[PDB]
Each structure stands twice: as C-alpha cells, then as structure tokens.
Design a protein around this ligand. Structure first.
Ligand code: A1AYB
Length: 209
C-alpha cells in the first residue's frame, strides 16, 4: 500500500529553487543533514532524561555516513527520536511553509542558499546532490515508514518492509550522476571536518570493499 501526496505549493517552489538555481557550493547538504541528525538525537536524549524507557528501542546515540558506489547512494543514519507517519507528512517534522517564506525573504535581502538551515528546511538541501531521496524512520510511538520523492511535486509514504531500525532516521541520497564526489572517503572526511568537527555525537564514516 503506497500513498502519494502533493507537496504544498510553497515546498514545491523551495525544491524547484534548490534544483534549478546555479549554486556551486553544494557540499553544505551534508552539514545540514548532520545538523538535522544532531537535532533529532538531542530530542530523544532530552525525553530520556525523565523517562529512561524511551531508550528501550536503542541506547546508542550516533550518526553513521554510509557511501555505496555500486548503488550510487550516500546514506546518513542516526538513532534520534525518529518521525511518526504524521510527521513524515507535514514536511518531515518541519515548519516548512513558514520556514520557506522566511528563507525566501532572506534570499531577496542578500542571503545565499547556504543559509537554508537557519530557516528549518535544511533537509531539502539534499536535492542539491540527489535526484531521489528516501527517508526510512522509526519513532517510539509509531511503526517504521518510508518516505520518498524525486521532487516533481509529489512524495510517497508506505510502511517499510525493510530492515527494522529500532529507532531513528535513515536518509538515503540517490546521487545525481555528476555528484559522485560525495561517495569518496577523502571528500566526505573533508566536509565533515570543515562543517561538523564539533558535533556532539560520534560520526562514523563507513568504508567500502
Ligand atoms: C548547530 N548545532 C549543531 C552543531 C554542533 C556542532 C557543530 O560543529 C561544528 C564544527 C565545525 C564548525 C562549526 N561547528 C556543528 C553543528
């Protein structure tokens, strides 16, 4: 059972701007997704301060970066609070309509695309480098779900049959053909050190055979 939804108009415009504006500094997508993962980890940590059972679904709080050159995918995994089906609809737990409006105003006042994360819609910077994005997520209060979109105005949500995650979020970036530099170990390391060296969770960069 696959459900197909239309993006709200303003989110569709945000995605079209990210895809179609000439902007060479694409590497910021990874900073934004790691920052989102840190935010999600902070949330489950905070809930666990008063209810330890919130970590029955997994005590480890971490971020994994998994490149796969055969699949041409970069996957960012975190064991944060995850998202309910309702959160996945409703723009992956963001205030994306008002955030996009504020981001648009800033761009017209001289800001650039790299400020996107200050407006709460940093997730959509994934489309700087990905032709399709798959989000697998498990929240303590819901079942495991998969969100997917190749932009073009729509996304899908289905129950995830795949590997159980326990708790957290997996962002799978299906990279554009000309953006495979983001599968190279030395490139990922360089970006993580430049933008995320002080993240307060362990970031493990997986290697390949
Ligand atoms: C914005 N809150 C999350 C967060 C925390 C630490 C962090 O680390 C670095 C590393 C290099 C330069 C700047 N910040 C990056 C993001």
């Amino acid at each position: 059972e696959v459900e197909t939804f239309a993006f709200q108009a303003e989110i569709a415009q945000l995605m079209s701007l990210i895809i179609n504006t000439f902007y060479s500094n694409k590497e910021i997508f990874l900073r934004e997704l790691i920052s989102n993962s840190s935010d999600a980890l902070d949330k489950i940590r905070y809930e666990s301060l008063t209810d330890p059972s919130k970590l029955d679904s997994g005590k480890e709080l971490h971020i994994n970066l998994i490149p796969n050159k055969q699949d041409r995918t970069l996957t960012i995994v975190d064991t944060g609070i995850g998202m309910t089906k309702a959160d996945l609809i409703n723009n992956l737990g963001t205030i994306a309509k008002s955030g996009t409006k504020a981001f648009m105003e800033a761009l017209q006042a001289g800001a650039d695309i790299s400020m996107i994360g200050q407006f709460g819609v940093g997730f959509y910077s994934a489309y700087l480098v990905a032709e399709k994005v798959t989000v697998i997520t498990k929240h303590n209060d819901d079942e495991q779900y998969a969100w997917e979109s190749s932009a073009g105005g729509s996304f899908t949500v289905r129950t995830d049959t795949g590997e159980p995650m326990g708790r957290g979020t997996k962002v799978i970036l299906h990279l554009k053909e000309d953006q495979t530099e983001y599968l190279e170990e030395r490139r990922i390391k360089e970006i993580v050190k430049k933008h995320s060296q002080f993240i307060g969770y362990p970031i493990t960069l997986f290697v390949e055979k």
